[PDB]
């Protein structure tokens, strides 16, 4: 939503409480501009982990790969994992 | 895990990413994906979004466990290990 | 800045300006629990096309190279670019 | 306005691509980019700080802004829709 900075000071805990609960981020508006932003604390902390993954050097090539290996059912079996690993 | 427990699923990609890792890592990244992540995959990482919407990501220790909630197989689907820096 | 709602509400209009002016986020708690961040709508902005360019295949060793480039005063003529693509 | 510098890189990139994106993004580098750098891009986080983007058609601009010299240093021309 888009909503001005007086209505959104009349009602912040009820903005608050929706922003929590639904993930929609409030363009709090001063003259007719957008100015800040209410968003959800884990709205927030995904997009910036997405930077962090992406930032990662294979990232986006290995999920490519490990995508295409559920779309083959290529799956290592567990028990050969958790031996090899895990002492 | 109950009722409809879950389980791991590990693609070829992550088992190579965990070969590749010091056998340190490697060992504290699979006690963690079996243990802490089974049971709370929803909980213990975040949804990644743009291109990677559809997937989770949990940090720990010099490991980032790229992972899919996949509830119609009830299966965590590991994707990609990758080392944190 | 944490910070509790009914402060927030208070000087919306300030924190408002502040998290605009530097690009500081306010964390509000509601009863003793977090649950909103007031970002700055350019400071999320700079995050969201942050996203957009490390997804980009490439753009990250190109960006690297392109550093290169200025650091070595390796510039093309602007006539030349001009030329090969306007008329 | 701002002066321009075309790294060899950001030159490649152009080289690269669809002409009708390259034409649309040269006009647009030289025409408004120059005149307002800081408005028309977004500052650029981790990594990348220091650095701007701008979007437009299917072109990306990433450049750094040399007040200090009133200048425009192009660094990379990206595809827009391009992903993994
Ligand atoms: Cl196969």
Known sequence: ????????????????????????RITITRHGHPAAVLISADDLASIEETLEVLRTPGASE???EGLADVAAGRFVSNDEIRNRYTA | SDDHPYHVAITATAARDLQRL?????????????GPLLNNPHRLGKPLRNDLEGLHSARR???????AIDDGHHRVEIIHIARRS
Do not use: M, Q, W
């Open chain 1, 1 to 24: 939503a888009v909503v001005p900075l007086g209505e959104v000071r009349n009602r912040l805990s009820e903005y608050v409480a929706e922003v929590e609960l639904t993930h929609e």
């Open chain 2, 22 to 34: 010091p056998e340190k890592i490697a060992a504290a990244c699979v006690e963690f994906v079996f």
């Open chain 2, 61 to 67: 220790g010099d490991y980032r466990v790229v992972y």
């Open chain 1, 62 to 64: 290995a999920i490519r």
